[PDB]
Ligand SMILES: Nc1ncnc2c1ncn2[C@@H]1O[C@@H]2COP(=O)(O)O[C@H]2[C@H]1O
């Protein structure tokens with residue numbers, strides 16, 4: 001991948017342990033990132049710091065792109081390493097020079113913006129159409145259809161903490177706890193184990 | 201406008217769409233890029249029961265139908281419907297990609313708008329997640345008060361909007377919108393006069 005490697009030679013590259021914060025919402029946006037290895041969560045918060053994950057981003061993903069096309073913008077979200085990460089960074093100013101040399105690097109970036117918009121639009125859809133019970137139910141169902149969902153004699157089973165579920169739908173761990181109990185008692189799932197079984 | 205947009209537009213056909221006509225249908229094969237020369241549109245998606253949600257309004261100078269551009273074989277991710285009479289330039293993706301090669305600035309213009317839509321749709325996903333239906337409505341009326349067609353008034357801004365529209369934006373029924381709008385004007389936050397609302 002000649003264009004990528006060229007792009008990266010113009011970056012500086014650093015390692016970040018899991019749980020460390022790469023981007024703080026509200027900071028001035030002046031640099032672009034690219035994930036060389038690992039995974040990050042893109043997070044927003046309510047006024048009391050309850051979190052919602054807008055996306056996971058993985059190796060090959062650009063981050064910090066949204067301040068690129070107009071000066072004076074702030075980071076729109078927190079971005080937090082979910083595993084140990086290797087992350088390339090480059091100033092918007094140097095990136096813009098790179099685009100002049102070869103606009104393919106802009107194509108790649110824009111393709112990812114367009115995917116993100118489709119996915120975030122779909123999520124806003126579910127947030128409008130579903131209450132917190134439906135959100136959690138549709139999350140568990142989505143997760144059971146993932147390539148990594150394990151077969152179970154009674155349906156599919158998943159590994160996912162209550163806090164992670166809470167991050168997906170933007171509710172507390174305890175709210176998740178209560179609604180999982182309700183869904184168990186409605187005979188839709190079982191969560192009495194260290195994992196979750198979605199029936200059917 | 202500038203010589204670059206005019207260059208781009210001379211490679212487009214201009215089509216007219218009457219108010220309430222659909223420009224783009226969800227699920228259609230995406231092979232075409234659009235640009236709004238005049239007028240305004242609504243972007244909509246739907247739940248399995250035919251409930252509609254307004255993801256966004258877009259206006260003169262806005263690109264539409266861009267999300268299929270970066271990868272072949274995609275579907276339209278939403279319906280796009282004329283809110284007023286519209287004049288809309290259109291061009292095939294393939295021909296757009298050729299233009300990008302002559303002058304990458306036209307891709308820059310487009311990517312700028314994608315970045316803005318991702319910021320706006322993320323903030324909206326947060327609203328839907330974190331706010332109760334009343335907070336969604338009170339935030340929506342501010343956002344509406346800075347659409348191109350929301351003009352001034354002694355005690356703040358003034359807008360025209362239906363209950364159905366608001367309900368489509370925040371995710372609730374007209375009836376519920378009616379009850380909340382009533383609450384909001386007791387809380388001396390607005391005054392309503394038919395379909396026209398003054399936002400303080
Ligand atoms: N809805 C989203 N989906 C995926 N990534 C996002 C989303 N919102 C923000 N981001 C990423 O989080 C970053 C926060 O900083 P920026 O606003 O500079 O750029 C942002 C994007 O790279």
Ligand SMILES: Nc1ncnc2c1ncn2[C@@H]1O[C@@H]2COP(=O)(O)O[C@H]2[C@H]1O
Pocket residue numbers: 117121224230243255256263264265266267268275276277278279280317321
């Ligand atoms: N969240 C959004 N904000 C603004 N416009 C959007 C949004 N989602 C979809 N659209 C527009 O609606 C169009 C539907 O067709 P496309 O998916 O080709 O391209 C889409 C975008 O131009």
Ligand SMILES: Nc1ncnc2c1ncn2[C@@H]1O[C@@H]2COP(=O)(O)O[C@H]2[C@H]1O
Pocket residue numbers: 128129130250251252253363364365366367368369370371372373374375
């Ligand atoms: N709970 C909901 N979540 C998302 N959208 C809704 C919900 N309830 C109603 N809507 C949509 O918003 C519209 C507002 O006007 P109507 O009540 O005619 O029809 C409504 C539905 O299409």
